[PDB]
């Protein structure tokens with residue numbers, strides 16, 4: 001509650017459609033155009049690995065083999081209820097690609113590791129956009145919600161199927177328009193909605209998965225990461241927009 005004050009008039013203008021229940025969290029957000037500052041950094045966010053930010057997007061992991069990249073908020077958020085809207089592209093030659101992209105709310109920053117570019121044994125929630133079918137069950141690309149409390153090693157080989165709280169099968173690769181994921185944590189419920197990028201309409205969201213009465217840490221960083229394997233897609237994020245929800 002209470003409108004954001006630590007912002008310039010150009011940035012106010014820049015984020016106009018976002019400011020105009022829902023309170024825009026400027027300090028936990030990024031977008032183009034001019035996504036990046038004259039010194040190459042994304043204001044309020046740190047990047048690591050192979051991630052390279054530019055004016056229009058952050059290429060988290062480019063289409064080389066065995067790449068890892070991530071981007072994380074510099075500080076933790078402390079929101080009872082929240083909603084992130086993440087806009088991205090996963091592009092590659094051919095109908096099959098690897099490995100995928102992850103959106104995180106975790107207690108620490110997962111700068112580097114083996115889990116879509118970020119740290120294993122995390123404390124909080126990952127939403128995994130897993131493009132490659134490691135278990136051969138012919139059910140990728142898939143979106144899987146994986147909670148963790150610092151104890152679990154992510155089961156890469158089964159596509160996290162044995163550890164997933166919820167999941168849906170959606171092809172988010174090679175789409176005419178950017179793909180969008182909206183992730184909502186509200187009154188103990190985690191919801192994933194996907195805009196699959198067939199349409200110019202940015203609000204054409206379809207239900208994907210839900211976890212009722214989920215627990216997550218009271219404070220955490222938001223993050224996004226990706227990785228490639230033998231096959232390699234470009235994984236690009238165009239914007240990450242955070243909102244704090246009340247009542």
Ligand SMILES: [Ca+2]
Pocket residue numbers: 099130131132133134156159
């Ligand atoms: Ca996989």
Ligand SMILES: [Ca+2]
Pocket residue numbers: 132133134135136137138139140158159
């Ligand atoms: Ca699979």
